[PDB]
Design a protein around this ligand. Structure first.
Ligand code: SF4
Ligand code: SF4
Ligand code: FES
Ligand SMILES: [Zn+2]
Lengths: 96, 84, 114, 91, 207, 690, 126, 48
């Protein structure tokens, strides 16, 4: 989420914020600091694991030519979950 | 005087520096026995005119060429340096 | 050691040309401080002419000298005619360029530049 | 798949799993090794490994490690063999 | 027949090669290394002492009526001792054919002008002078054409930085536009893009 | 005539030695044949089958990586059959390759991409489903993504033949062949990061450099390494004034294509615990930030009020010859000659008067000519790996026989362990040790001693005993008078330059006559300490990190690092090698010799040189071996040094001389740049855990 | 227009508009770029390069981009030989430190060595 | 959009804003990066 610093400046999803002693905060005087309140990491964490009955699943994202290149994910390690490299969707072998 | 270092420059394969190599092999041993705590540096290089740098106190250096000498001229120059 | 000459077969004729050019500039400076309404005197202009001339005093090849004279005549044309404004003329004086010192130690205090 | 070609430790299949050759298996191993030149004794890997399989019925990681220790071979040179040949039962 | 490759006709190659032999044996005193390309284009390289004779012959001669000077360029190749490769692209309306004549120059090795032949070359030679530093002879008015009125340097030389050495701004103190040494907020990013694998074995340079 | 044979490459003829391969000949005429499995330093393997060419009047195609060249063979590199073979192999390689290029750190520098664009087709007729492989986890340095392995076996052959681990292989067969280990096992050797360099397809990548850049962005600066004293050649990739990684260079004499993990992964320390501003003590005795003028004025005052034998300097290991010579000139102009190092070399005897006594006279490439090698008090593995790698290469190809007087270690190769105590030296010399038989029947032996052995009190005794042994060796075997048997291996970069400059090695003179104004240049090892020096001793510390010497300082002059300056560093052989500037120092940090010249000018002193060429002319004056870059100067005065050193009445202590780096957990953190690296800490935490 | 006796070393500084700074205080580097070990291609190790000394790069406070006061920060020239580059440098008035070309040494290679009766070339990884 | 409406997505805004130049609630640019190089933290104790 958008947490603030001891100076009140908001910490972006990059972990960036100016130190209290930094002079570069005048640019935000009588103005605002533009941040994106929808952190993609928390969002993609809020999504569930898509189970599958096949040991090797593909992921194009969604929409076909509107998603990402089709990659194939192995799901042998039953403790871990396979994560697409383009999107962050997780997949798990249903029958292990 | 205030002598601190003697550093000898010469070549490994060249005539001009032939006097310094003979001098070394024959007398550097005895001379470094006589003066044990005095640096006597030999930094032989390639295609370098041979020289003898004697640097005295308060960073003041001398230089006397040794191109195309014998070992005896070298000995005399070195002892002249030592004595002063 | 054998090459083709541009104009001068020796440095003396190139020096003759250089002197002609110096005369032209020395005679022109007043007319262009009058016309361009420059806020400098006539002595500053001629000192600047002499300085820009000495800037290339070290040359010994007559071809470099001939090309420098050609460039100087080009500039003198651009100036005799008012093709260039007071801006380009006062560019020579560098009234705003903070003068970097030649003291090793100041160059050391400000920056890593040698 | 079923033939994974990887090994993730478990209580049944770990290095501490209790494998060891019998005093008869050791003499059979000595003979086998003797069937090859003196400098080349890393060629008994296959027969010694199938022997261990016969004694134990199957092949746990400790079995391969002990085969290596006996023949003084790297255990990966035995993992490769076991995975490559199908007669070797790793479950 | 193949739809992606480009249809190639040898007839133009032959025509241009024959005309190149013509030019070479009619101007031996100047001609060097005539050559024709896979794409049908004739290139006649010469000694700069031959500029005016060659161009006048190609303009006035009957079997060669190249009387329109399309372009006039230069090419900096710092490797060779004579860097600048001056190029004369020409056109014959009578034969619907083109041709290219090339010379070589240096910082201190000027050549002759052809305004006596093609008046179109006044500004092109002024451009060559302003951009590369090549000086021409017997030019009516040889000055700068494209650069600023007090510009030092010849920017198309490979040794000249893309961004130059100075930079302009307005100073209220003097109330004028002044020139200060360059200083950028974002430095141009040099991308090394050449693939390390030979791409065209027909142009391989033997060691 | 000398067994050469004539062969053609598209008509062009070339004469090649027998055993030469088609690939080497096509190279000898400037043609580079495609490759995915041949690497020029690894056993041949005809796996990728991408090297396929046709031979004139021959039906099928041969593997140019493995087929030796026969007389009169004409090799058609650009014929239809060769092209179609390449296209087929590319179809096959890319059939199961994942669409990962835009998340693959190898993008832009992938051999698969370039070879597909230059030798393969532009289409895919694969209408099936690819495969996938569960990624391994072999440590914190190498990231494994094995859907991208093209099973070239380079990693395996490198681990086995060059590193000596033999823990990587191929599990399974067929299309489901899984390169890697069969069990979870960290592949943490000291030559592990090179598997990244030889994996062409991004399966193996640097975890630090992960995602941080792309090759076209980087600007490549050719420099050298300083963590060791080998002088490994490296390329420093930068991206908008920031070091992105360290990548090796090629030098067949030193570091053919390899570098240690400490060298390529400890660049993360240059981004941490850095001195960016001159500091000085306040009235309370705390370190505060101030200017250059103020600190240099303080130091110049203190220097003005002191003279010889009360001033002293100390170098640390990451120092450059320019700073050393400048500080020496300064101290000399204030009459001091107590210039010392932190590393202990014995001056007993000839000392630094002769380079033969503190160099690797049998240069690194000399291990390839040798027949016997004897290691004394060294673990060259953790102390100078590339040297150990060369010894292993010889042990492999030239059947080299190694021996070691020291504590038993692995070395990645097998060796004859004689003993531990240094009394084995007298027994090897006087002719009573078993090894004497080998030694007598040998033709080209070379002994190599470790500075580590010279740190203990008996360094001079070990040295004189080794001299005796070497002399008797030369006498018995019958060496050719151009073969150098006695060598010394250093683990500290600046040492050889300091000794060539006249520095008196070791800090003994300081302890003897302690100073009142100590200079502390790069020294962060902790040899001296205020408990050993007068009270109120003015200490000024130069450097680039704040590890050890800065906390104990009264002034701090922030210097530059090796990626931040141009500098001459000399290696164990005497090969002067120059660093180049990839980045500028941070904040108000500066070149060291620059700092010292400004210090002098502020004082009444003034050194003559205002530039770097002048400093290097001074170097030429003092020692002209420091300017002959990339060159090694022969030195042939060992006989005299031995005659001289046969006259010291010291004996060894019989204590078993053991090296300080006994395992790899004692290898990743040895200097400040390494101790300030989070990556080397990750490495230690991986190795100690398991 | 016959020939002329110059008899001196070439000097082009005065015709290039290059400031005294970037002629006196510049050290050129002449070298053959080293092969990138991430790749086995050897086609960029053929032509000689000319590269200038690196100078400061400071973050821009506004965005955080890299700034310079060095026009020649990205100057790269390509030559076919070493003498050509040295001549260009001398001509333009620069100081240069040359670096010889590094060619790999020819290497004996045999696929049988991997299979030996008595040597250590015998590999265990086929 | 009253007949063919857009697709619903969480992250999409529910209140459109106009051009907010020369106001507060405008855009000011800044570095989204953290510090690259870290300085040495001097100790709080003196050498005595
Ligand atoms: S992991 Fe890389 S180096 Fe190893 S076999 Fe696969 S492609 Fe080759
Ligand atoms: S290894 Fe090469 S081809 Fe494969 S994903 Fe990476 S960049 Fe693309
Ligand atoms: S290069 Fe020959 S099979 Fe790989
Ligand atoms: Zn996806």
């Amino acid at each position: 989420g958008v947490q603030v610093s001891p100076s009140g400046e908001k910490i972006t999803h990059t972990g960036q914020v100016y130190d209290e002693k930094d002079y570069r905060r005048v640019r935000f005087v009588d103005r605002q600091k533009e941040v994106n309140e929808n952190f993609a990491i928390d969002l993609i964490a809020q999504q569930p694991v898509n189970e599958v009955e096949h040991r090797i699943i593909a992921c194009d994202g969604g929409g076909g030519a509107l998603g990402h290149p089709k990659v194939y994910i192995n799901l042998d390690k039953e403790t871990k979950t396979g994560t697409c490299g383009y999107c962050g969707l997780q997949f798990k072998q249903h029958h292990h | 005087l205030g002598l601190r270092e003697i550093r000898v420059h010469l070549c490994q394969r060249s005539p001009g520096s032939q006097g310094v190599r003979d001098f070394i092999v024959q007398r550097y041993v005895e001379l470094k026995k006589a003066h044990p705590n005095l640096p006597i540096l030999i930094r032989e290089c390639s295609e370098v005119q041979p020289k003898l740098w004697a640097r005295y106190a308060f960073g003041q250096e001398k230089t006397v060429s040794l191109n195309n000498l014998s070992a005896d001229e070298v000995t005399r120059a070195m002892q002249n340096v030592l004595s002063g | 050691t054998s090459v083709k000459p541009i104009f001068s077969r020796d440095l003396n004729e190139a020096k003759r040309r250089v002197r002609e050019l110096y005369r032209a500039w020395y005679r022109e400076v007043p007319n262009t401080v009058h016309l361009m309404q420059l806020d400098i005197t006539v002595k500053q202009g001629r000192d600047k002419v002499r300085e820009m001339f000495m800037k290339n005093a070290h040359v010994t090849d007559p071809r470099v000298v001939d090309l420098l004279v050609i460039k100087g005549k080009m500039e003198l044309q651009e100036t005799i005619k008012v093709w260039k404004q007071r801006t380009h003329v006062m560019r020579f004086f560098h009234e705003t360029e903070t003068p970097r010192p030649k003291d090793f130690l100041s160059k050391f205090y400000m920056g890593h530049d040698p | 798949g079923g033939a994974l070609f990887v090994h993730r430790d478990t209580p049944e299949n770990n290095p501490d799993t209790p494998f060891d050759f019998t005093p008869e298996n050791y003499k059979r191993i000595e003979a086998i090794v003797k069937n090859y030149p003196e400098g080349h004794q890393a060629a008994a890997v296959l027969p010694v490994l199938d022997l261990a399989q016969r004694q134990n019925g199957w092949l746990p990681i400790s079995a391969m490690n002990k085969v290596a220790e006996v023949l003084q071979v790297p255990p990966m040179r035995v993992y490769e063999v076991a995975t490559f040949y199908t007669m070797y039962n790793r479950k | 027949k193949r739809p992606t490759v480009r249809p190639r006709s040898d007839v133009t190659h032959k025509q241009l090669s024959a005309f190149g032999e013509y030019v070479a044996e009619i101007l031996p005193k100047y001609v060097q290394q005539v050559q024709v390309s896979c794409l049908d284009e004739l290139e006649i390289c010469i000694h700069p002492d031959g500029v005016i004779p060659t161009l006048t012959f190609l303009r006035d001669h009957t079997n060669a009526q190249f009387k329109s000077l399309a372009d006039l360029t230069a090419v900096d190749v710092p490797t060779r001792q004579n860097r600048f490769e001056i190029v004369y692209n020409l056109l014959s309306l009578r034969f619907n054919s083109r041709i290219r004549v090339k010379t070589y120059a240096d910082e201190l090795t000027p050549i002759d002008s052809i305004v006596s032949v093609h008046i179109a070359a006044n500004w092109y030679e002024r451009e060559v002078w302003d951009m590369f530093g090549v000086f021409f002879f017997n030019h009516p008015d040889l000055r700068r054409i494209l650069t600023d009125y007090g510009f030092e340097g010849h920017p198309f030389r490979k040794d000249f930085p893309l961004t130059g050495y100075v930079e302009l701004r307005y100073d209220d103190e003097v109330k004028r536009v002044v020139a200060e040494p360059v200083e950028l907020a974002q430095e141009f990013r040099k991308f090394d893009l050449n693939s390390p694998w030979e791409a065209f074995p027909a142009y391989r340079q033997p060691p | 005539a000398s067994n050469l044979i004539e062969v053609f490459v598209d008509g062009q003829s070339v004469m090649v030695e027998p055993g030469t391969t088609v690939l080497q000949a096509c190279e000898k005429v400037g043609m580079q044949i495609p490759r995915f499995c041949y690497h020029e330093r690894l056993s041949v393997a005809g796996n990728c089958r991408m090297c396929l060419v046709e031979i004139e009047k021959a039906p099928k195609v041969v593997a140019a990586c493995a087929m030796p060249v026969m007389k009169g063979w004409n090799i058609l590199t650009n014929s239809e059959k060769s092209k179609k073979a390449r296209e087929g192999v590319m179809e096959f390689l890319l059939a199961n390759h994942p669409l990962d290029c835009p998340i693959c750190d190898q993008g832009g520098e992938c051999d698969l991409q370039d070879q597909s664009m230059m030798f393969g087709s532009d289409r895919s007729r694969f209408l099936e489903g690819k495969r996938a492989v569960e990624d391994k986890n072999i440590g914190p340095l190498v990231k494994t993504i094995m859907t991208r392995c093209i099973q070239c076996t380079r990693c395996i052959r490198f681990a086995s033949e060059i590193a000596g681990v033999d823990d990587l292989g191929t599990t399974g067969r067929g299309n489901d062949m899984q390169v890697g280990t069969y069990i979870e096992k960290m592949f943490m050797s000291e030559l592990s990061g090179n598997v990244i360099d030889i994996c062409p397809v991004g399966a193996l990548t640097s975890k630090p450099y992960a995602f941080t850049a792309r090759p076209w962005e980087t600007r490549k600066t050719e420099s050298i390494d300083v963590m060791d004293a080998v002088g490994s050649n490296i390329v420093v990739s930068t991206r908008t004034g920031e070091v992105m990684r360290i990548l090796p260079r090629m030098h067949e004499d030193i570091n053919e294509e390899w570098i240690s993990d400490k060298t390529r992964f400890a660049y993360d320390g240059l981004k941490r615990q850095r001195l960016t501003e001159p500091m000085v003590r306040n009235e309370k005795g705390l370190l505060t930030y101030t200017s250059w003028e103020d600190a240099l004025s303080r130091v110049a005052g203190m220097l003005q009020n002191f003279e010889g034998n009360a001033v002293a300097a100390i170098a640390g290991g990451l120092v450059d010859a320019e700073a050393l010579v400048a500080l020496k000139d300064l101290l000399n102009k204030v009459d001091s000659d107590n210039l010392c190092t932190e590393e202990i070399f014995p001056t007993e005897g000839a000392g630094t008067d002769l380079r033969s006594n503190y160099l690797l006279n049998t240069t690194i490439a000399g291990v390839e000519e040798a027949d016997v090698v004897l290691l004394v008090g060294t673990n060259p593995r953790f102390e100078a790996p590339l040297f150990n790698a060369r010894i292993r290469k010889s042990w492999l190809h030239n059947d080299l026989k190694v021996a070691l007087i020291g504590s038993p270690v692995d070395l990645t190769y097998r060796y004859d362990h004689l003993g531990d105590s240094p009394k084995i030296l007298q027994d090897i010399a006087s002719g009573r040790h078993s090894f004497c038989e080998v030694l007598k029947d040998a033709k080209k032996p070379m002994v190599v001693l470790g500075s580590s052995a010279l740190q203990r009190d008996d360094g001079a005794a070990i040295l004189v005993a080794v001299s005796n042994m070497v002399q008797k060796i030369r006498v018995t075997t019958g060496v050719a008078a151009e073969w150098k048997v006695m060598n010394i291996l250093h683990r500290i970069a600046s040492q050889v330059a300091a000794l060539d400059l006249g520095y008196k090695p070791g800090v003994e003179a300081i302890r003897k006559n302690p100073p009142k104004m100590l200079f502390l240049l790069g020294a962060d090892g902790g040899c001296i300490t205020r408990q050993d020096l007068p009270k109120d001793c003015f200490i000024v510390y130069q450097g680039h990190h704040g590890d050890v010497g800065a906390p104990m300082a009264d002034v701090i002059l922030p210097g530059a690092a090796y990626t931040e300056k141009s500098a001459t560093y000399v290696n164990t052989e005497g090969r002067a090698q120059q660093t180049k500037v990839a980045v500028t120092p941070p904040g108000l940090a500066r070149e060291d010799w620059k700092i010292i010249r400004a210090l002098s000018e502020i004082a009444g002193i003034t050194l003559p040189y205002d530039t770097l060429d002048q400093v290097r002319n001074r170097l030429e004056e003092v020692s002209p071996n420091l300017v002959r870059y990339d060159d090694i100067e022969e030195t042939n005065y060992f006989q005299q040094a031995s005659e001289l050193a046969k006259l010291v009445n010291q004996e060894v202590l019989a204590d078993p001389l053991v090296p300080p780096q006994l395992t790899i957990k004692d290898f990743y953190m040895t200097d400040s740049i390494s101790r300030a690296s989070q990556t080397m800490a990750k490495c230690v935490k991986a190795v100690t855990e398991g | 227009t016959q020939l002329i006796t110059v008899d001196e070393k070439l000097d082009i500084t005065t015709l290039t508009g290059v400031p005294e700074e970037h002629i006196k205080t510049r050290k050129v580097r002449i070298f053959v770029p080293a092969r990138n070990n991430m790749q086995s291609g050897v086609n960029n190790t053929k032509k000689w390069k000319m590269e200038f000394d690196t100078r400061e790069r400071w973050e821009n406070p506004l965005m955080g981009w890299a700034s310079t006061a060095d026009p020649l920060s990205n100057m790269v020239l390509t030559f076919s030989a070493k003498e050509d580059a040295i001549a260009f440098a001398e001509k333009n008035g620069w100081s240069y430190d040359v670096e010889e070309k590094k060619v790999p040494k020819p290497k004996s290679k045999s696929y049988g060595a991997n299979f030996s009766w008595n040597k250590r070339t015998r590999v265990s990884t086929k | 959009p009253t007949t063919n409406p857009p697709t619903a997505r969480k992250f999409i805004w529910t209140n459109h804003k106009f051009n907010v130049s020369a106001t507060p609630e405008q855009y000011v640019p800044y570095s989204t990066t953290r510090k690259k190089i870290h300085e040495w933290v001097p100790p709080s104790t003196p050498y005595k």
